[PDB]
Paper text:
Mpro is a cysteine protease that cleaves at no less than 11 sites on the replicase polyproteins. Initially, Mpro releases itself from the polyproteins through autocleavage. Then the mature Mpro forms a functional homodimer and transcleaves pp1a and pp1ab. Given its essential role in the viral life cycle and the absence of closely related homologs in the human genome, Mpro is considered an attractive target for anti-CoV drug development (12–14).
In an attempt to crystallize wild-type (WT) apo Mpro, we obtained a crystal form of the enzyme that belongs to the P1 space group. We determined this crystal structure at 2.2 Å, and it showed there are two pairs of Mpro dimers (AB and A′B′) in an asymmetric unit. The AB dimer is almost identical to the A′B′ dimer, with an rmsd of 0.065 Å for all Cα atoms. Interestingly, the C-terminal residues S301 to Q306 (corresponding to S3564 to Q3569 in the polyprotein) from the neighboring protomer A′ in the A′B′ dimer are observed to fill the substrate binding pocket of protomer A in the AB dimer. Similar conformation was observed in SARS-CoV Mpro, suggesting this is an important intermediate state for these two viral proteases in the cleavage cycle. This structure therefore represents the postcleavage state for SARS-CoV-2 Mpro in the processing of the nsp5|6 substrate, where the P1′ to P4′ portion has already been released. The P1 to P6 sites take on conformations similar to those in the precleavage state. At the active center, the complete carboxyl terminus of Q3569 (P1 site) is close to the thiol group of the C145 nucleophile whose thiol sulfur is 3.8 Å from the Nε2 of the base H41. Additional interactions between protomer A′ and protomer B are also observed which may play a role in the cleavage event. The alignment of protomer A and protomer B shows that the loop connecting domains I and II serves as a hinge, which allows domain III to rotate by ∼5°.
Residue numbers in the entry:
A (entry chain C), B (entry chain D), C (entry chain A), D (entry chain B): 1 to 306
Amino acid sequence: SGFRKMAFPSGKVEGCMVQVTCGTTTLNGLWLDDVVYCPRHVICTSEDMLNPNYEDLLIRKSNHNFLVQAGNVQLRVIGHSMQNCVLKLKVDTANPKTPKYKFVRIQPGQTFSVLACYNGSPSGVYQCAMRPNFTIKGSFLNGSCGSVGFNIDYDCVSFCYMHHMELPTGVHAGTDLEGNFYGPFVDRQTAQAAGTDTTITVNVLAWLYAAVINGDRWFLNRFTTTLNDFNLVAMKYNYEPLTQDHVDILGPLSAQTGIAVLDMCASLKELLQNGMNGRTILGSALLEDEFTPFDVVRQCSGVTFQ
Amino acid sequence: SGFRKMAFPSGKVEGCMVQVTCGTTTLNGLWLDDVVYCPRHVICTSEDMLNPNYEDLLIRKSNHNFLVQAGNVQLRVIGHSMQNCVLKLKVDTANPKTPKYKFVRIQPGQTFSVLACYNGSPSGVYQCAMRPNFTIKGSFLNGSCGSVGFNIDYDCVSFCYMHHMELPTGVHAGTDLEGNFYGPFVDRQTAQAAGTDTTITVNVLAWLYAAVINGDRWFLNRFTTTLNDFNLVAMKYNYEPLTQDHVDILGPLSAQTGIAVLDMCASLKELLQNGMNGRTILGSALLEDEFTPFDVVRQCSGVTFQ
Amino acid sequence: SGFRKMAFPSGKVEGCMVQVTCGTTTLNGLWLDDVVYCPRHVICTSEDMLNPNYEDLLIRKSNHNFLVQAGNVQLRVIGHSMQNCVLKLKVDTANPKTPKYKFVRIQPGQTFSVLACYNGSPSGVYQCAMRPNFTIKGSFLNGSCGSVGFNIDYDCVSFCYMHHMELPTGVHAGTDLEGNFYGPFVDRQTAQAAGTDTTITVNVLAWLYAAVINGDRWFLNRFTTTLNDFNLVAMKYNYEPLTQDHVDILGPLSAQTGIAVLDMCASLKELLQNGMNGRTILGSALLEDEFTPFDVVRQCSGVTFQ
Amino acid sequence: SGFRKMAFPSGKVEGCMVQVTCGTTTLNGLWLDDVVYCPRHVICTSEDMLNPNYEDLLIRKSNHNFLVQAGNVQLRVIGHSMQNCVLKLKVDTANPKTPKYKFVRIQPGQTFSVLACYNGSPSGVYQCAMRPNFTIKGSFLNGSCGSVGFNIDYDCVSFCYMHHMELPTGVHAGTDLEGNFYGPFVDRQTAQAAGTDTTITVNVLAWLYAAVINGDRWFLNRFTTTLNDFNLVAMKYNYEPLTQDHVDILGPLSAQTGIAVLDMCASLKELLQNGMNGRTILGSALLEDEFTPFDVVRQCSGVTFQ
């Protein structure tokens, strides 16, 4: 059957992407019903970004000062509002391609698909995970701002990310669709730095369950451990602690494999403790942590014998 | 910045996916203008895939034997014909979401996006390379047959792949959109295999150029070499040979990148001979070979698809 | 005199439940006369389930390799044989609580009571219907295998289900008591998935008749339709087609109510189109389809005027 | 996995059901040791239920006036006594199938299984909640009087209900096994009425906890909130108030769940104002309130009754 990093079909998001121009500044907007959402820094010049008073900058702007283009058609702005670090433009027309949607704030370790856009036009779709330090290892160039991250569940799009900025490391920072940054980042030109990042343990454990299903079992051992002594070990190798919720989420893969969450944890403890040889697990030289348990279950579609 | 496995925006393809049912067999079809393209093995029952006479099986069916569903709405079949291993169903209605399209046959080492579909409903998109042995390392479950692969340029979708079958290895085989298999595979359940797999050298070289553009230069070697030197070492490491044709196509990635080709080859030779050992490239310990020169240029300059 | 999902009294089945252990594997067995029935996968390890050859696995096992416990008393195995996906263990003692029984294979849409058991000990009893896709929406954990489904008719138990496995959805698969799976499922660890499910129309129609008997009649209209046009409509809403047998089975509820099967069908067709303005029928927000016509007649012991 | 309204295994209760006849009146009795418990209204004739003097009616009867049948075998009555609204008939023989039992009085919102019996013969088992207004929404026909409700812990049956009568609404009234009515109801044909009705908040909350353990998590609103502002909002939707005792009892689930308490209340508030938009919880569009915390724990960990 095989196993691969897959993104959601991007079509439902493609039908919402628009271009937003304010003065000399252009980035991407999301057109849902009669609202267009983008980063509020669209109203800013590079000089404005040094000490930005967004309230003053916005009172000085009018509806006419916002050019919103949905391909060929101009959309008239009939109202402009600000919520946290995102801007909302009320327009003449409701997007007739508006999908069933939700705004959700995701947790560190959860995954979503990014549609990288420029000038309101899709370039690319890729799968990524919200890192523990509230950054994403993305692919974004100048003009990518306003690109969204999302999940699709039942023809319902859960928008979970809007792109704002790139950090020294080359990793990316943004907001949920309510304007609130992930992490301790701000939309102003000052010295910021991504905190030391950590490996998403629950995702590594799901990846190992995927490895077992696809033929690789060399790493598995007979022994088990208790939960706290694994977590102590995890801190030593910069792995996130494993919540009971994480164990509970691992339940289905445990059921199919017949390998207890705490059993898999013990095998992982020794992979990290002794280091490893030049071994590829699931055709990877390094442990992959941007697959969630639900990602692995979605693709492997195995059964449980009770 | 950043570098990620990027798929094309799938929206234009999503609008063409339909379900095709013949007897108790259902798989995916591609609805372009007033034609629906699907694997001809849709006419084959679950019991009969051993060694079928496709000509006989098709003449014994008429148009009413083909149920085509485009979401809720039934599409009337007004004609059936077979071209190579693909079935073409003429329907009374032209897909109003038909994009500007082309049918192309791709070369070993070239990349495309797969839209994994089930029951005519797109589930996922991933980027894929046609392997040297004319297989793809895909992610497919039962019901995935008729899923297509494609490239986009400007507004024009180039369909290059239709999924037909899975081999013993777990790798996948299919056709171009004219019904001709990639590799020496047949749409009958027999002992077939190609395990002539090699690493796509020209793709690895472009991936390294992408690493240079995005700030990874740790691996780089200061000295220069000759083209003969690569082929010896490459065969030992299971890497395909290189040609002046490949170098000519790499001309852009020797310009802004402004780096020599055999210098990159020397860096690969030493890293392949002994592992990078704790130092990673674009977040990966392993040389990745599913990026073409044009893939790196599109991603690093942000080309958009209207 | 209300209406509620009722299961059969479980006592006669409880007197047949035993524990079966083979090596490290334990599940439930049914003890009828001098035979104990369980899933054949009791002889399998988790590794065996990857590619199980049951014939070899069973020839290697002996009678004394099967530990059969009926509470405190050990039952000696004097013979083992396999029939389809069920294992049959002959023991030296006939269950003195053996009830009058039959093995029947039920149809999609028929209902039965499940006695969920662990370690040969009853946990619970619930009512469920065999879904059209040959799955059951059950409640089963690890160790539930060998749990049976049944109907009781005249102090005679009709066993119709034995639990084997859980699918990705969280729905359940099993066999009749001759070892033949309901649906296209196999007792192997491979990629399986439940087909898209459909609503049991004849059961929905019985539920509506129950609604009328208990006071709720708002949905009833002045008009009728013919049979095929409703069936056409049913396909649109994913409802099973209504066979003449189904009309015939609906005869008694039609007789009491004085509402023709085809009259009730028309009311359903209109509550199918535009759903309805959100409200409860028989205390339910959604159409219930795990009541059979015979279930409704059993509870609503009404009179037919002539 | 899965979640079902599950009733206790009824076998231990089935072995205690007998038929009690006085004049032309027959109903069900409970045979424990050498005592048979039944409604005292068995001594009342069809005509004389308006306002009877139970003391006078009983003194005018002797032991021979009571016919007790346990299947085919006649049980001789050697003593009759009345305790509250229950008649106790001493018989010469102890029920050899007497289980380990207890008599308990349950609180509003607690659950039990009803074994619906007719002519001393069990017909059905269902799970029931004692409603706030001290009624049960049951399924009873003529002949159902004396049917009992019960819980099981270990090998010990806790009898908590005996059915006496049906009210105008179609809901049901009865006693504990000491003859004291639940609610302000009397075994006399007068104008009496339930009237009160709330949804059992603590039970709805546990149902949501069950949904989480089984996978449904679409509904969640992952905020924190106060207990007071829930109480105000819940009364507006006619939901019972909450207590710290209730929170304390919900402590055990929170260990496995790893989930906050106030979050569920917000999710309920928004579902109560939203309709659920057609998307269901454990297969239900309506909040279900006939599951206690211990019901969810017993069902999700598979406890068994020896």
